């Protein structure tokens, strides 16, 4: 690591200029190789400096201070580099001590819809760049899809929960800036069938291995066999898995068929030999009689009578020779049949008990993608894989909300303000919002640009919950309908005493049917207090929303009783149940690559909108409407860090637009 490790931590190749860098420094990247390596060093070093101390602002001066020759010889290059990094939120982002107090007077006015992480992140950035920033939040709280339940000492995240490894995670920086209590998750997850009996390590390891092998198989189907369109429709992951399983059941049968068919060839070969043997014993029976009769003719006898005895003696031993060579053959074939019938091929591909545990592994995947596997795009469901972080996944032990709240400090946030209409024209924007409490109480907001961090579920609403004037262009609205917005729910169970294995972080429950594989399939022990957290995933998630809390808490205890003892499970003091699809400010949990979509749609979502000219024949206008949010970041969708980065991204773009890019020259 060191200089090179900082580039990795900032999600950048240490020894190559990015496309964004090619854009801002076209003089360098087109120029000689020597210059490029100097550029790259300056970049990497500046990042290192910022990362090593992320709680204070890193100024141009401080950066130049700690450089060597010939890296500090060119001060305009260093300044361009520093400014580029600062603009695009690679350095001086989040919550840090400011050296030069905020600029005396502001430039430009920006309305940000929603104070989710993406919103807040961008807000802080723009305010850092000296812009007038006001966020409009429909909820009575910040954070949005980052929600944390708090009551007494009970702390449990109903929204975002896991930091998916620190290796290249911008949340690594944030966690140093905010008092986040990050605790690692222990991999092991013991399973328990419907009865309450633990799945033995025999089955457990077998099914899981088969699960992973089934996934690889679908990948093979997609890329190598190009099985992606079936009857004009795009093939889902669900379809692909069924197809693979069926082909694996087909093989199990094919094996048996040509094994028994192998027996009948040997069995029928024996049939033919036994016939030859019986027909020979018939001739031997008759020949012995003839020889006997010939020997009863007592001597002296003429030569023909002597010859008869000898002839029949020769003819018999010759036929007795054959029969013994056939009893030889019989012996070999007889045990060759005991060979084949001793070791048959697999009876079944998977039993009912097996297929149920496999459904749990599917449910786990349905949780991860927050959607039934029949909706995920086979080809693209995992497109964001290459950009996955290193390090073990962690949980915010003191509640994730600590992060949005900390980001929200020093920002103009209008809570309980539901945006109803967004108006954007060549000369500017007006945002029409109402008070959520008295919905007849109206607000108008005027701004140079609108940053829209509305969830994809919201953008999907029909009839629309937010109106765009003029209407969003066809290419944008298509991208909204194509993309998948999933669902995933959490059940918070607060007890007074820990009745589970304290060294076990998570344990599964296997449902009875495929239909209900997602229903309460997983439990979390993560926090200080005795809190267990139950997940509702897949198809089950959407249906469980129409069921009342008591019943859900019922099924929860029922299951927990089955695993720990019908008496060892007390009544829960506090219970909370999420309903994200029902939540009007979410309309679901987070995005997924739906069948018929791709990673490209995420880029489309990020592309800003530019209004038509006021006066016809007037010049091409500035872009006015911008989009950030978890569903706009192709390489980090459906996460916090994704949102966080999408925020930083738009901020940089908006600041470039309205304050001007001073660093490109």
């Amino acid at each position: 690591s060191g200089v090179e490790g900082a580039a990795f931590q900032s999600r950048l190749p240490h020894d190559r200029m990015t496309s964004q860098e090619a854009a801002c420094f076209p003089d360098i990247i087109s120029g000689p190789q020597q210059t490029q390596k100097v550029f790259l060093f300056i970049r990497n070093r500046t990042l290192q400096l910022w990362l090593d101390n992320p709680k204070i602002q890193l100024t141009f001066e401080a950066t130049l201070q700690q450089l060597e020759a010939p890296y500090n010889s060119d001060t305009v290059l260093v300044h361009r580099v520093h400014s580029y990094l600062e603009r695009h939120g690679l350095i001086n982002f989040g919550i840090y001590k400011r050296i030069k107090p905020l600029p005396t007077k502001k430039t430009g006015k920006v309305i940000i819809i929603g104070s989710g992480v993406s919103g807040l992140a961008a807000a802080r950035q723009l305010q850092s760049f000296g812009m007038d920033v006001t966020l409009l939040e429909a909820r009575d709280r910040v954070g949005g899809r980052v929600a944390t339940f708090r009551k007494g000492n009970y702390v449990a995240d109903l929204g975002a929960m896991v930091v998916t490894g620190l290796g290249g995670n911008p949340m690594a920086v944030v966690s140093k800036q905010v008092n986040m209590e990050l605790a690692k998750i222990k991999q092991k997850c013991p399973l328990y069938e419907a009865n309450g009996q633990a799945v033995p390590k025999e089955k457990d390891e077998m099914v899981e291995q088969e699960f992973n092998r089934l996934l690889e198989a679908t990948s093979y189907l997609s890329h190598q066999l190009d099985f992606n369109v079936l009857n004009n429709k795009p093939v889902s992951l669900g379809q692909a898995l069924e197809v693979v399983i069926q082909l694996q059941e087909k093989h199990v049968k094919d094996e048996q068929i040509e094994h028994w068919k192998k027996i009948v060839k040997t069995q029928e070969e024996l049939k033919e030999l036994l016939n030859k043997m019986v027909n020979l014993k018939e001739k031997i029976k008759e020949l012995h009689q003839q020889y006997k009769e010939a020997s009863e003719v007592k001597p002296p006898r003429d030569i023909t009578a002597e010859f008869l005895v000898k002839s029949k003696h020769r003819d018999l031993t010759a036929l007795c020779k054959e029969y013994d060579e056939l009893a030889e053959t019989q012996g070999k074939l007889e045990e060759k049949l005991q060979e084949l019938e001793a070791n048959p091929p697999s009876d079944v591909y998977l039993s009912s008990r097996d297929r149920q545990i496999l459904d749990w592994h599917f449910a786990n995947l349905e949780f991860a993608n927050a959607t039934p596997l029949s909706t995920l795009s086979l080809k693209h469901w995992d497109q964001d894989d290459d950009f996955e972080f290193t390090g073990s996944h962690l949980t915010v032990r003191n509640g994730y909300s600590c992060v949005p709240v900390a980001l929200a400090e020093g920002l103009d946030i209008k809570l309980n303000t539901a945006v109803r209409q967004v108006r954007y024209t060549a000369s500017g924007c007006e945002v029409i919002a109402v008070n959520t409490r008295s919905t007849s109480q109206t607000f108008i907001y005027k701004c140079d640009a609108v940053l829209c961090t509305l969830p994809l579920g919201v953008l999907k609403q029909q009839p629309p919950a937010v109106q765009f004037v003029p209407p969003l262009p066809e290419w944008k609205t298509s991208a909204v309908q194509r993309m998948g917005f999933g669902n995933l729910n959490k059940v918070v169970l607060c007890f007074d005493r820990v009745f589970w294995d304290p060294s076990v972080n998570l344990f599964g429950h296997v449902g009875s049917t495929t239909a209900s594989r997602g229903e309460l399939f997983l439990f979390w022990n993560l926090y200080k207090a005795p809190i267990l957290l139950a997940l509702v995933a897949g198809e089950a998630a959407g249906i469980m929303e129409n069921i009342s809390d008591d019943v859900i808490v019922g099924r929860c205890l029922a299951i927990l009783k089955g695993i720990f003892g019908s008496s060892a499970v007390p009544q829960p003091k506090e219970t909370v149940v999420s309903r994200w699809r029902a939540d009007p400010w979410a309309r679901g949990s987070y995005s997924y690559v739906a069948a018929g979509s791709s990673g490209n749609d995420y880029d489309l979502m990020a592309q800003p909108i530019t209004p038509g000219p006021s006066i016809p024949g007037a010049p091409q206008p500035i872009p006015r409407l911008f989009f950030a949010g978890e569903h706009t970041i192709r390489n980090y969708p459906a996460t916090v860090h994704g949102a966080l980065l999408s925020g930083l991204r738009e901020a940089g773009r908006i600041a470039d637009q309205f304050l001007g890019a001073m660093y490109t020259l």
Partner: peptide, 6 residues
Amino acid sequence: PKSFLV
């Protein structure tokens, strides 16, 4: 996405 897998 993929990364949420247990």
